[PDB]
């Protein structure tokens, strides 16, 4: 049907007048074309919902693989638009194989050219799976995903927003293209840092914290404050693993990625799904996008039935991701950062470019009460049971008053600089701009 | 004291081979060089006799230095673990130093083999460090404590063998070192393929299949049939994600990795944890030049809980990436059936499989005949009277099977390279892996 026409959809994604088909238009079920997105040379393809419901066949898959080869050869970002019931069943194994070849193209392009998927209609089988292999998936609210064993039929607002496969949910198809468009800008027009612009955007970000250090808040406004005032923050997977906020924005015009623990959920603790962070770190590392890491993390948690496997493994990926990272990655410790979670959240030991702290920030092996329970075991043990807890609290209060602390952390060298939170934005920019583009 | 580090290092290394990398102290770590059946190995042991083996700045420094040495020499490195975690009194300095150990392990990852042998209590950084290594062997008296800011305190038999972090559970401490030693030999004495040795060990492996294709069976005897008959198959994570069997062994003397769907569980289907188990294992073998045998009998994939799909979708992608990027030889053997996306993931030609073999009655298809027909012939089936619908469905299915699924069709298309006599499975696999380049695909 006319609204599902591939050339139409492609023409809606591309800059007006920039479309050049990569092959003769047929009934293969895909149409690939070159064009520009705000002037950036971009390859794109669109499944043809007007033909067998966009079902993927041999000839169609060959157009996609060809488009990928073209994008890789030119080092151009590649955007797929999806509306497809999966493989053409009647073609059998030939289509099966052809689909796998699409996957292999996507794997070859991985970390080399940006791959953006825009899901605008129905998607099942290999057409649901394809997007899963790309870097950022944008879903139109009308889009539907279906997957079954040897079963789920949902839209993004009903399922996929909360499952970490969908990165961004749009307002409508047109808006989905707009976001897709803005995504290639973020990857392919990364811009440059500007001290002046950074300084002029400075606010007392610290005022966004609640009065009690012991209580939760939403970190998102802090992210907002750091990033350029009237440029959107493109948060990924906002409703999946919400103890961890990640996404792309601009910092004095320069594309940067942000990771921030969100105390709003699970007290900001890391867990299996949030350790989301690993994949995002690899994304920015792949494409030369520097990182701002906002740390407020009291530890890590197990899953459903207190199972530890997920967080131990996903955590390992996080450690690797940061440890291997070579783009600049600056850490800001806002309130608390303890133990293994501290090590994992862009610590110095993992080659963090620079670590900043707010004056009241705390860096420690563990919580005061736990530490004190261990350090003063003799006095605690020897106490009468009815005073033991009061003693413990007294010990803990004094320990948090005189231990932890930025001054001690500066002395060791795990924190590089304590900063006035009113210059948070400008200090971050400086540290990132002064950093080498690679190594660290 | 059995927990003496030099004692433990001596029980691990070849007798007489031990040379310390530093003067003994009370830092809580002893690192040494030595040999394991001849191969130069670097090892370290936390010292349980000193502060429960708690890790401090100087001990960590000994481990980091041991890592630097092993990396420099391209020697495998083995940690023996018995530690309560960081020395709390040293505070942030010790925390920092623990991270530095992790950083060293990350630098070593994929470059030299890292083997952890957990022999005692492990907590904090001491439980976590092994999680960064390639293969974790756990002594049955080892105990891991992990906690949030409830908590978990268990041994290998009750907790960790079933959680995928522990690869191998040993019979005792000494047996743990022996498994460790054998793992060194598997990584560092990979040997070479032998065509004659392979042939002499051929059996009718098909006989290990049930007469009926609808019925479950254990794939482990099939793996055992393929590998050298008097050589251990060092299965990893046997109790975690048991629909997938992976591990290391020898094929005519040559170290190989095996991945095999196991229809004993979940019908042999892929799912979140079995995809993750395969993906890590493929990466591990790819990293160290170890060729792969992929025994495929997979009907599809399964959601999680609660029918959560997120996990299998994401871990599946990892599995696809792992095979797609793999450059060591990887040969597939389709034994019974392989369908759809699962078929793609399990080392398909589209992901640059080195060679795909199939047994004569194998089937490679987008789905089962009955299901394909339910879709292709939707109208006739619906238009059919209910009393006659099933018979019509089976008739169409039987006809459809004739032109879709079988090996002959697959051979023509090119997704299967060769149909083989199951009595020559072992030797045929050996030949394909032997004549493959050490690197490309
Ligand atoms: C040919 C077939 O293609 C598919 C179908 C499903 C599909 O999704 C998955 N494939 C494999 C796994 C894995 F690897 F976990 F087993 C998971 C999924 Cl969702 C990928 C390709 C189709 O479109 O019918
Ligand atoms: C049953 C238990 O499973 C666990 C327990 C601890 C756990 O964390 C570790 N397990 C093993 C090691 C090893 F083997 F490396 F020492 C380390 C950790 Cl952190 C993972 C899963 C659970 O989830 O409660
Ligand atoms: C210094 C500290 O070292 C640790 C403690 C726990 C620890 O475990 C974890 N660390 C981080 C995560 C993550 F990343 F998932 F949040 C998970 C664990 Cl289990 C690692 C190192 C200690 O031994 O107390
Ligand atoms: C809530 C739902 O989550 C899903 C549902 C489908 C699902 O599979 C996909 N979802 C989204 C896409 C996208 F965004 F790429 F189009 C693809 C797949 Cl395979 C993954 C998780 C669930 O777990 O049941």
- Are the C-beta atoms of residues B41 and B33 closer than 8 Å to each other? yes
Closest CA to B64 of B89, B98, B40, B41: B98
Please state the CATH superfamily assignment of the domain spanning residues A193-440 in this structure.
2-enoyl-CoA Hydratase; Chain A, domain 1 (3.90.226.10)
Helix (H) or strand (E) holding B234: strand B234-236
C-alpha–C-alpha distance, residues B345 and B323, integer Å:
8
CA distance B225 to chain A (A): 29
Q: What is the rounded distance in angstroms from the CA atom of residue B187 to the CA atom of residue B189?
A: 6
User: Is A96's CB within 8 Å of B269's CB?
Assistant: no
Ligand 1 centroid–CA A1 distance in Å is 27
A254 touches A191 (CB < 8 A): yes
Secondary structure (3-state) at A321: helix
Q: Exposed, middle or buried by CB within 10 Å (0-12, 13-18, 19+), for A207?
A: exposed
Contacts of B149 in chain A (CB under 8 A): 267, 269, 298-300, 338, 366-367, 370
Structural element, H or E, at residue B275: helix B272-287
User: Domain extents for chain A?
Assistant: 1-192, 193-440
Question: Any idea what DSSP says for residue B38?
Answer: T
User: A187 alpha carbon to ligand 3 midpoint, in Å?
Assistant: 33
Q: What is the DSSP string of A140-163?
A: -TT-EEEE----EEE-GGGTGGGT
Q: Is the CB of A339 under 6 A from ligand 3?
A: yes
CB of A302 closer than 6 angstroms to any ligand 3 atom: no
Locate breaks in chain B with C to N over 2.5 A; list the residue preceding each. 149
CA nearest neighbour of A217 among A260, A250, A168: A260
A365-399: buried (b, 16+ CB within 10 Å) or exposed (e) per residue? bbbbebbbeeebeeebeeeeeeeeeebbeebbeeb
Mutational pocket test of ligand 4: of A83, A120, A153, A159, the residue with most ligand atoms within 8 Å of the beta carbon? A159
d(CA A190, CA B134): 37
Residue A426 DSSP SS3: helix
Q: What share of chain A is helix, strand, coil (3-state, %, to 5)?
A: 45, 20, 35
In this structure, what token pair is assigned to residue B194?
């032998």
Q: Which residues of A221-254 are buried (b: 16+ CB within 10 A; e: fewer)?
A: ebbebbbbeeeebbbbbbebbbbbbbbbbbbbeb
Reported resolution, Å:
2.3
Q: Quick one: how far is CA A61 from the chain centroid?
A: 29
| Inter-residue contact B117 to B36 (CB < 8 Å) | no
Q: Give the 3-state secondary structure percentages of chain B, helix then strand then coil, rounded to 5.
A: 45, 25, 35
> Mapping DSSP to helix (H, G, I), strand (E, B) and coil, where does residue B49 land?
coil
For residues A239 and A222, the answer to whether their CB atoms sit within 8 Å is no
Which pair of tokens denotes residue A121? 């209609």
Which atom of ligand 2 sits closest to the CA of residue B118? 16
Whole-angstrom distance, CA of residue A345 vs CA of residue A295: 7
CA distance to partner chain B, nearest, from residue A188 (Å)? 24
Rg for chain A (alpha carbons), in Å? 24
Name B406's bridge partners. Answer: B363
Number of H helices, E strands in chain B: 15, 19
Give the C-alpha separation, B436 to B438, whole Å. 6
Nearest to B67 by CA among B31, B92, B14, B39: B31
d(CA A387, CA A237): 48
Residues B44 and B64: beta-carbon distance below 8 Å: no
Burial (0-12, 13-18, 19+ Cβ within 10 Å), B207: exposed
Provide DSSP, B153-211.
EE-TTTTGGGTTS--EE-SSHHHHHHHHHHHHHHHH------HHHHHHT---GGGGS-S
What 3-state DSSP class applies to B414? coil
**Catalytic: which of A49, A54, A125, A247?**
A125
CA atoms of B77 and B59, how far apart (whole Å): 16
Q: Which CATH superfamily is domain B193-441 in?
A: 2-enoyl-CoA Hydratase; Chain A, domain 1 (3.90.226.10)
Beta bridge partners of B358: B334, B419
- DSSP state string for A178-236: HHHHHHHHHHH------HHHHHHT---GGGGS-S-TTS---SHHHHHHHS-TTS--EEE
User: From start to end of A272-338, where are the E strands?
Assistant: 291-297, 329-338
CA-closest candidate to residue B117, choices B159, B179, B33 = B179
Q: Give the DSSP letter of residue A15.
A: P
DSSP state, A317? H
CA dist., res. B254 & res. B430, Å (int):
9
**What are the residue ranges of helices labelled H in A293-384?**
309-324, 339-344, 368-375, 377-382
Integer Cα distance of B220 and B207 in angstroms? 13
Check: CB of residue A340 under 8 Å from CB of residue B55: no
Q: Do B88 and A366 touch (CB under 8 A)?
A: yes
Three-state SS at B404: coil
Phi-psi map region of B125: left, alpha, beta (phi>0 left; psi -120 to 50 alpha):
alpha
Chain A residue with the nearest C-alpha to that of B364: A93
Q: Which two tokens stand for residue B149?
A: 């800011």
Q: DSSP letter at A27?
A: S
B143-147 and B114-123 beta bridge pairing: parallel
Alpha helices (H) in A345-439, listed in sequence order? 368-375, 377-382, 385-402, 406-412, 424-434
The residues of B annotated with a catalytic role in the active site are 124-125, 341-342
Question: Which ligand 3 atom sits nearest the alpha carbon of residue B102?
Answer: 21
- In this complex, do A90 and B376 lie within 8 Å of one another by their Cβ atoms? yes
Q: Hey, are the CB atoms on B99 and A347 less than 8 Å from each other?
A: yes
| Nearest CA distance, A19 vs chain B (angstrom) | 30
Pocket test for ligand 1, best of A126, A131, A154 (most atoms within 8 A of CB): A126
Pairing of strands B363-365, B330-339: parallel
Chain breaks in chain A (C to N over 2.5 A) after: 150, 275
- Cis preceding linkage at B306, omega within 30: yes
**Whether B116 contacts B81, CB under 8 Å:** yes
- Residues in a beta bridge with A37: A40
Tell me if B176 sits within 8 A of B137, measured CB to CB. Answer: yes
Burial class (CB in 10 A: 0-12, 13-18, 19+), B441: middle
| Cα–Cα dist A302/A312, whole Å | 9
- Residues of chain B with Cβ-Cβ distance to A338 below 8 Å are 149
B128 in ligand 2 pocket by Cβ < 6 Å? Answer: yes
Q: Answer yes or no: are the C-beta atoms of B410 and B358 closer than 8 Å.
A: yes
Where on the phi/psi map is residue B148: left (φ > 0), alpha (ψ -120 to 50), or beta?
A: beta
Alpha helices in B74-161 (DSSP H): 92-108, 125-131
Residue A90 CB neighbours (<10 A):
15
DSSP B344-398: HHTT-GGGT-SEEEE-TT-EEESS-HHHHHHHHTHHHHHHS-HHHHHHHHHHHHH
| B100 and A349 Cβ atoms separated by less than 8 Å | yes
Q: Contact at 8 Å (CB) between A440 and A353?
A: yes
- CB A160, CB A147: distance < 8 Å: no
Taking an 8 Å cut-off on Cβ atoms, the answer to whether B96 and A414 are in contact is yes
Chain A neighbors of B415, CB-CB under 8 A: 93, 96-97
Establish whether domains B1-192 and B193-441 are of one fold: yes
Residue partners of A34: CB distance under 8 A and separation at least 6 = A18, A19, A20, A22, A41, A42, A43, A44, A70, A76
Contact B100 A151 (CB under 8 A): no
Contacts for B238 with CB less than 8 Å, ≥ 6 apart: B161, B245
Contact call for residues B252 and B430 (beta carbons, < 8 A): yes
Beta bridge partners of B357: B333, B418
Give the DSSP H or E segment for B301: strand B301-302
Q: What is the rounded CA–CA span in Å between residue B164 and residue A203?
A: 47
Yes or no: say if A39 and A15 are a contact pair by the CB < 8 Å rule.
yes
CA dihedral A65, A30, A111, B287 (to 10 degrees): -50
Give the number of beta-carbon pairs within 8 Å between A and B: 205
Candidates B246, B308, B299, B311; CA nearest to B273 is: B311
Compute the distance between CA of residue B241 and CA of residue A437 in angstroms, rounded to an integer.
41
- How far, in Å, are A225, A258, A263 from residue A335 at the CA level? 17, 17, 11
User: Which is nearest to A82 in space by CA: A55, A103, A107?
Assistant: A55
Active site residue A111: no
H or E element that contains B67? helix B57-73
Question: A161 to chain B, minimum CA–CA distance in Å?
Answer: 11
* Beta carbons of A77 and A184 less than 8 angstroms apart: yes
Number of other CB atoms surrounding residue A69 within 10 Å: 14
CA distance A105 to chain B (A): 9
Q: What contacts A207, CB < 8 A, 6 or more positions away?
A: none
Number of Cα atoms under 13 Å in the Cβ half of residue B265: 16
Helical (H) or strand (E) element with B279: helix B272-287
User: Measuring CA to CA, which residue among B252, B257, B342, B255 is closest to residue B296?
Assistant: B342
The technique by which this structure was obtained is X-ray
* CA angle (A284 as vertex; A328, B271 as ends), nearest 5: 135
CATH classification of B1-192 is 2.160.10.10, yes or no? Answer: no
Out of A29, A86, A121, A126, the active site residue is A126
Q: Is the CB of B146 under 6 A from ligand 3?
A: yes
Contact yes or no for B324 and A104 at CB 8 A: yes
A80 labelled catalytic: no
Rounded-to-integer distance, Cα B315 and Cα A47, Å: 25
Contact present, A86 and A126 (Cβ < 8 Å): yes
What is the separation of C-alpha B18 from the centre of its chain, rounded to a whole number of angstroms?
31
Q: Is A305 helix (H, G, I), strand (E, B) or coil?
A: coil
B293 CB-side CA count, 13 A:
31
Ligand whose nearest atom lies closest to the CA of A273: 3
Return phi, psi of residue A193, to 5°. Answer: -75, 150
Q: Which of A305, A257, A233 is nearest to A428 (CA)?
A: A257
B422 ligand 2 Cβ < 6 A = no
Q: Closest by alpha carbon to A437, among A277, A265, A274, A285?
A: A285
A241 phi and psi angles, rounded to 5 deg: 50, 60
Cα–Cα distance between B110 and A108 in angstroms, integer?
20
Q: State how far the Cα of B175 lies from the Cα of A276, in Å rounded to an integer.
A: 39
């Amino acid at each position: 049907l006319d609204p599902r026409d591939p050339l139409l959809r492609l023409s809606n994604f591309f800059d007006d007048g920039s479309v050049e088909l990569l092959h003769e238009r047929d009934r293969s079920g895909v149409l690939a074309a070159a064009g520009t997105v705000n002037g950036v040379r971009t390859i794109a393809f669109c499944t043809d919902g007007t033909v067998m419901g966009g079902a993927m066949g041999v000839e169609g898959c060959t157009h996609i693989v060809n488009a990928y080869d073209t994008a890789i050869e030119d080092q151009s970002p590649i955007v797929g638009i999806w509306h497809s019931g999966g493989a053409r069943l009647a073609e059998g194994v030939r289509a099966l194989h052809a689909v796998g070849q699409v996957f292999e193209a996507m794997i070859r392009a991985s970390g080399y050219i940006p791959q953006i998927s825009v899901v605008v209609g129905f998607a099942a089988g290999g057409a649901a799976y394809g997007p899963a292999l790309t870097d950022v998936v944008v879903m139109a609210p009308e889009s539907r995903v279906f997957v079954t064993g040897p079963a789920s039929l949902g839209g993004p607002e009903t399922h996929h927003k909360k499952s970490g496969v969908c990165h961004i949910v749009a307002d409508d198809e047109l808006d989905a293209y707009d976001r897709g468009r803005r995504l290639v800008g973020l990857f392919c027009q990364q811009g440059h840092f500007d001290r002046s612009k950074a300084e002029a955007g400075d606010t007392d970000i610290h005022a966004l914290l609640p009065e009690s250090s012991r209580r939760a808040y939403d970190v998102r406004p802090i992210v907002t404050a750091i990033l350029d005032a009237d440029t959107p923050f493109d948060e990924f997977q906002a409703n999946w693993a919400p103890s961890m906020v990640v996404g792309l924005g601009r910092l004095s015009g320069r594309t940067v990625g942000v990771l921030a623990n969100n105390p709003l959920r699970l007290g900001g603790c890391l867990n299996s799904e949030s350790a989301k962070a690993a994949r995002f770190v690899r994304l920015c590392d792949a494409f030369g996008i520097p990182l701002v890491v906002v740390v407020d993390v009291p530890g890590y948690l197990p899953g459903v039935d207190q199972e530890w496997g997920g967080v131990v493994r996903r955590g390992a990926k996080l450690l690797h991701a940061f440890g291997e990272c070579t783009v600049p990655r600056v850490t800001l410790v806002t309130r608390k950062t303890y133990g293994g979670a501290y090590i994992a959240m862009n610590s110095r030991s993992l080659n963090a470019t620079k670590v900043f702290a707010w004056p009241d920030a705390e860096v420690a092996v563990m919580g005061a009460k736990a530490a004190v329970g261990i350090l003063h075991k003799k006095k605690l043990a020897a106490a009468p049971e009815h005073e033991r807890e009061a003693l413990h609290d007294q010990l803990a209060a004094e320990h948090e008053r005189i231990a932890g602390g930025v001054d001690s952390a500066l002395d060791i060298g795990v924190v590089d600089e304590k900063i006035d939170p009113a210059h948070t934005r400008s200090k971050l920019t400086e540290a990132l701009a002064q950093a080498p583009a690679r190594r660290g």
